[PDB]
Amino acid sequence: GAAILPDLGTEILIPVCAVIGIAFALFQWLLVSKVKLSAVDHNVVVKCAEIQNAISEGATSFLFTEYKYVGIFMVAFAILIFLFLGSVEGFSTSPQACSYDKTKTCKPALATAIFSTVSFLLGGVTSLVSGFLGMKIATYANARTTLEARKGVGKAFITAFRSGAVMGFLLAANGLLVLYIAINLFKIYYGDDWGGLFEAITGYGLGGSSMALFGRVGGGIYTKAADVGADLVGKVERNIPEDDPRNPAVIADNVGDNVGDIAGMGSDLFGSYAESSCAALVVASISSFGLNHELTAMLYPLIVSSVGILVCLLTTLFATDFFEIKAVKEIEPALKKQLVISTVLMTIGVAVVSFVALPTSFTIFNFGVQKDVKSWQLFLCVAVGLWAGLIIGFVTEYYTSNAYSPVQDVADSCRTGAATNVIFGLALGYKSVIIPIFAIAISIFVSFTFAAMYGIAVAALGMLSTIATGLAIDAYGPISDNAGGIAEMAGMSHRIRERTDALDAAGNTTAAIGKGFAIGSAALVSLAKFGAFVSRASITTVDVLTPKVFIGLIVGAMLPYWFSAMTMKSVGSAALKMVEEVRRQFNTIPGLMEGTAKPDYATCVKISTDASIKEMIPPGALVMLTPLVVGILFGVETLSGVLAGSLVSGVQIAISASNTGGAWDNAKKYIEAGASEHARSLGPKGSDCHKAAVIGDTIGDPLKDTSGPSLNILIKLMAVESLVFAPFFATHGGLLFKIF
Amino acid sequence: GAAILPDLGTEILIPVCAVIGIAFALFQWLLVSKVKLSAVDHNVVVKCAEIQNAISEGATSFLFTEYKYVGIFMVAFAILIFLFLGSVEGFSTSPQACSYDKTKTCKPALATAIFSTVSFLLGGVTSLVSGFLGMKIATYANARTTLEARKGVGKAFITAFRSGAVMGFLLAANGLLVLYIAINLFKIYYGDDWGGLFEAITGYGLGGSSMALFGRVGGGIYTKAADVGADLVGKVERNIPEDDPRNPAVIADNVGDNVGDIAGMGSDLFGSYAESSCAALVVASISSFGLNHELTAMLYPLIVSSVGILVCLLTTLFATDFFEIKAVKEIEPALKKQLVISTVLMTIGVAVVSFVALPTSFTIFNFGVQKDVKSWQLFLCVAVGLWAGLIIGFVTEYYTSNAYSPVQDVADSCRTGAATNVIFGLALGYKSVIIPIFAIAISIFVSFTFAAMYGIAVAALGMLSTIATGLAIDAYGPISDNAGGIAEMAGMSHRIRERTDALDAAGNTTAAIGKGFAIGSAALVSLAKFGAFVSRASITTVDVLTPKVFIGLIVGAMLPYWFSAMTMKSVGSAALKMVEEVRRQFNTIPGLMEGTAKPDYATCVKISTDASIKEMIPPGALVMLTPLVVGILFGVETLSGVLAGSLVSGVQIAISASNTGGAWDNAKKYIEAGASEHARSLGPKGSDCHKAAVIGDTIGDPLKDTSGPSLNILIKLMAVESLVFAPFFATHGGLLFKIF
Ligand SMILES: [K+]
Ligand SMILES: [K+]
Ligand SMILES: [Mg+2]
Ligand SMILES: [Mg+2]
Ligand SMILES: [Mg+2]
Ligand SMILES: [Mg+2]
Ligand SMILES: [Mg+2]
Ligand SMILES: [Mg+2]
Ligand SMILES: [Mg+2]
Ligand SMILES: [Mg+2]
Ligand SMILES: [Mg+2]
Ligand SMILES: [Mg+2]
């Protein structure tokens, strides 16, 4: 029945660990505030602050524009949720029997329609705040990482990493806390109807991933229109340094790192956290924990997260205080040791939590039957997910870091042109999918066998128990991107840019690694949500060999490709506008190409703003309308196949897009760095080889930064949407099969 | 119930229609031999036949080397079949209970292990023969297409199309006649055990696709290494023309067209035909047709194929006689009309066949249950697949022909370089999969609903009911591509090359449509085989939400990407060697660029021959070993997942690769033609736009001619293989689930 750790204990521990998380985050922002600068060498400090202000102004300006739209959609959609969910029992206010225990009476479905809408609003608002806070810290840390670079890599590393850790700890504690609050608040109303309490809390992950979808796509098109434009004309055509202040797209480019790579990624990861936690919660609510009203075991996923924070705080110190970087070859293994330490520390942490938060025996809902599960079996569920991440990390690294042969052979293929560079890169990413799929598959088999959907939901959360650390090394990247962006823009020494370029390359690998973690955990959470949807829809069997299910499967597998076609073409078209505008300024503003005259940055901000804001609508629509269109016309059996098909298919293309993109970026950085005979013999910057790498890198730009990373939101989003609307689809769905 | 057509009337009709087709082929070959030439204006006539022979020698050279390896593998594999299938019943020689009716007695399992092996070898040999024959007629008419180009486009077209029709009718009429002989020879032994007759006959399909796998990959690696290397040093670096006899890779390049695009393509479609016929047969054999021993209706697939030949013969006469081409703008429509005509006649053809060769009611095996099916519903099954092919073709043409916006917009994007070209192309291909997947899915729903697995199989055959026309227009492409390369190597007038390039661009679109049909029917056949596998393996339900099935599903979905990574990196590495070699000759043989000295052609053929033969092995291994590894270690449930996932996932990347690839080619052709204001504004040849387009085209080379077209084989092979080994798997597989 009960576990060692009493209910009230859990009620204290959880928000305590959140608060500690926010305290840590603020203490770090404080230490970062020690690096001083203003716009009132002395000049080089002033030039940094004026550039940093351009970016900060530019990124706050876009997010307000984007969130204004997204926020309107969020309201429209909350109405739908209410209407559709309320329409099931014809908006009755009368209680009915608990579908999980006919002897008992539950709160009316109308209530759950209402609280669903509230938890959705919470989830979406929290997702937006995650993006916004992430940008605010990144637009603050960027130039301070520039100034500290004067003292060498190791000092710049610290302000970039301390800052990344600001975002990670803020995001993780805030999401943990909101969920915690929402639960207790709702419980005031639901009392003993824990089934309906947690059914309403599922809106939270729906809100999270909904807003994230637009955040990622909008911020993604914005930033990559800029990037591909600046780089092509600036580097391939006009033969000037990357991020040169003469280049009119340079401000949009660096703003982009903050509205895409940081704000978009911030929200994306919030959704991953929200859904996984919520998937664990719903399965539990109709399992022995929820049925016996055992709060501690019921909140087991929240306790794992609480301990994850503490664990991640301790891990952070190893990079923050117990180790100084002195050479550039030490930067990555620092970042990589962050992963290894937290994984190892969390394993202990999780065994402890498994030991004191669970009863040694209990039951997990398994498609209508209470399965007998043991607490050590549950430990292995979260542990197999946790370690699957680390594996994915190691392998992604091997495939995206220019310290290894795969990428160096990609760089080396530039010797015969761009075409070979592109062929090697594509082949690289395809190859990269293999071990992660295997890690995902193993992870699924173990956790599925032990505790059905709950095991899988808990595996996903295992993969994100170290989410604070994971976020820091991820947010470290774009900060190091801006930092060398400001260095070049402020005409600082070549020795500064050399350091930032080592940081930036390190952030390239961790960018792909975090992408791997998002794909992996999104496959786990999707599979949990899918299987939960099936029960909720009163489906008896998802049988691949029925006509309804199979058409669902093959069409669902096509969706990720449809989505990719849209996002790619969007960037490809906006980048074409950027290139024309950049050329126009170079060819018609006298004095520009010789640094005597100033470029018009605002036009490039205006081109990327107009395209991202407009073009984030159709792919947002495909993802959000699909569950609804399919659920209503074809019904829940066809929807089942669609959920399965987009998972097994989306995952393949997300992984290879992100890795191919990463491999091209770092292949380029390798040539740029000339830190070996081989690398030098490919250089120098401007050579035919370097220009092949730049082409490859720019094709990879929208792959790894718009399509690739958003595809994991597609997969995990369609599953919560389906699970949430399942009562409506079960009852009013499959019209086409009814009219005929 | 029996049909209006008597069994004897069917035993006659089939080989008669075969022989007609074989006659019509022999006729067309002779008519083409009217064009006279030999290696003994007229100065140019002897330079052509000098080149043709260099091509024919080297093509025949490679196929022998390739087939040596393939035949060995074939003999080895035929043993595994005997051994595995033999060990089901412990190698007993006594009869046993029928697998589809315990109340009845069948022929011994060991007898079927033998006939399975005999049919496999039949299929393997008929497959290699299909590739080799196609190579002959191709390497025979290529120079004859060059020479006839001196008298307008419309008269070079004819010899090309006739010669294509030679290969079409030979391959269709022969694969049918070998199957018909095998069925009748086998019937002698099996007597009333029709169930075991057609169970053994399925090895035919396994034979074809097995040997087509290696032909495509090996013949596709060979050809593209050459293609990419030649084009890059030639057109991008040294600014010399495409197919310039100074370029030492032009021979391997033009040999490659016959060795890959012709030989590898003929085996591919044979395997498609064979599997579709067989799948129709194995289901029918345990349905009322085979149970009641009704030979005519039993042989319904072979009857449709027969009428198909006649229809195609009629249809072929339209483009080869009573309709002539004047404008180069008439070529594509002439080919496109071939499809429309044959589809329309064939719809009348199948109506007739359905009317006189079926009973009006019968039963179709439907997972252990005889399902009531009406003749007119079977009519719709083959019809839907027939029309879905036509739909697939038209959509393919829209995204691949430079007569429409998608490809024209892709050419446009060259104005901003190779990077935007590639981004636009990738996005086009992705975009291009939507409608074809909808077509396939609609076929699957309609056919599955009417007649279960039988319908699906009969739909696949419906999509290949006009295989001779389809093969005719498809084989026409590589004949034309060769024809222009001989013109350029003979040094003939540029009046000529603009005619051949018209042919060649038409052939380019055609090749993509061929690719669509192949994938479309592969998807359908794979589903039928998959469904037949499930019954044979005694699986009650393929339930998605079970661990064994899901890991099967996600890992299976990863497979076509693994395969891709191999085939891509292979071409990429061989192309890198090619470029270095061409560079070496140009930089070390004096007078070579000047046209005084002669290049070492034999070295380029040697780089290709080495790469392909060595590198076809692993992708082959992956496809053949997967059913065995999963079937043996994991069991039929998991192998069910792998079959579902690889179909569903593989089809997407198959379609998008072939289309992206075809699009980049035709965009480059658009610019090299200069037949419009827009076109001319991107030229001339040599420009930065033309060069960016060539970058795109050579990246697309391996996507559309190595990976893409082969991926469709991966799907239909793994399915039929699994079906053949089903009894062995069901009995002796699933080991890791038995040890633990
Ligand atoms: K990065
Ligand atoms: K062709
Ligand atoms: Mg860039
Ligand atoms: Mg950037
Ligand atoms: Mg950057
Ligand atoms: Mg970067
Ligand atoms: Mg970039
Ligand atoms: Mg070529
Ligand atoms: Mg060719
Ligand atoms: Mg050619
Ligand atoms: Mg061609
Ligand atoms: Mg080519």
UniProtKB/Swiss-Prot annotation, chains A, B:
Q: Which InterPro entries match?
A: PPase-energised_H-pump
Topology in membrane: Multi-pass membrane protein
List all membrane-crossing ranges. Answer: 8-34, 59-88, 110-137, 161-190, 194-222, 261-286, 295-320, 329-356, 376-399, 422-446, 453-479, 509-537, 548-576, 606-634, 636-663, 707-732
> Which GO terms of the molecular function aspect are on file?
diphosphate hydrolysis-driven proton transmembrane transporter activity; inorganic diphosphate phosphatase activity; metal ion binding
What regulates the activity here? Inhibited by excess pyrophosphate as well as excess Mg(2+). Inhibition by ATP, GTP, and CTP is reversed by increasing the Mg(2+) concentration. This suggests that the substrate is a particular metal complex such as MgPPi(2-). Modification of Asp-257 with DCCD abolishes pyrophosphatase activity.
Which stretches are Cytoplasmic in the membrane topology? 138-160, 223-260, 321-328, 400-421, 480-508, 577-605, 664-706
Q: Where does Mg(2+) 1 bind?
A: D227, D231
UniProt binding sites for substrate? K224, K704
Q: What else is known?
A: Has few direct interactions with pyrophosphate. Interacts with the substrate via divalent metal cations, such as magnesium ions, that are bound to the pyrophosphate.
Could you tell me what this protein does? Proton-translocating inorganic pyrophosphatase that contributes to the transtonoplast (from cytosol to vacuole lumen) H(+)-electrochemical potential difference. It establishes a proton gradient of similar and often greater magnitude than the H(+)-ATPase on the same membrane.
Supply the name of the protein: Pyrophosphate-energized vacuolar membrane proton pump
Write down the species.
Vigna radiata var. radiata
